[PDB]
Amino acid sequence: ETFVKDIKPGLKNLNLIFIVLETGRVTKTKDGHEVRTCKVADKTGSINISVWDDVGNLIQPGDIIRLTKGYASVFKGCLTLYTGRGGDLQKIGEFCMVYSEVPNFSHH
Template sequence: MANDTYHFIKDIKPGLKNLNVVFIVLEIGRVTKTKDGHEVRSCKVADKTGSITISVWDEIGTLIQPGDIIRLTKGYASLWKGCLTLYTGRGGELQKIGEFCMVYSEVPNFSEPNSDHLGGFPLAYNHAHSYAGTGRANGRGPVNPPIPASNNIQPLLTAVNNGRDPRRAFKR
């Protein structure tokens, strides 16, 4: 590889190109089809500095599994519905280099809508005004509901009693 510089997820900003990133796949999203028949999956991936969403198209998306350690070469970062997202660029590739054994952190999630990550992009470009207060641009509700400002903040505990993994309580 001509450019051996690797980026941590925490250093990825919208508009960066020729990104080389190593990450572990945490979750595979639902398949959506484009008007012209392409399959697109959004996958949550992470390294030791945080997590981000990567958009994976067509056959490659069927091959990726949670726990895969992948090297992205020649990727780029852009905003999709106000959320920072990684993509495989022209001539780029995703290569599986291992499984399961990688130190990672799910927080911070750099794909969550956040004005710090959006930088100097105008609202009309990043669509943040359309999704303000929803927590998620995909319409499935907030991942982390806003906590009202108060001087005596107490932890918010939510009991999920449906036999499901409590980390997936909001992902229906």
């Protein structure tokens, strides 16, 4: 497999599994596009991915995602992942909240 530590500026056809650590806040380009920076990672480290428009709304921290045919470049100083137009982002994992009753555990 490919690892985040092995990612450098100019890399191409990146096939990479990662987990979302952070979902940054969305900014707007000159042409009305919504762009959002996410901090994603594997055990070998973290990296930024730039995500565009509605894809941005489909991502939460904890999400396990497979990137296909991605590429890396520098944007405003930061190393950044991008989805290739002939590629894909695939969610293969997520963490969910489940309610559980508790037998009157006392804090004291």
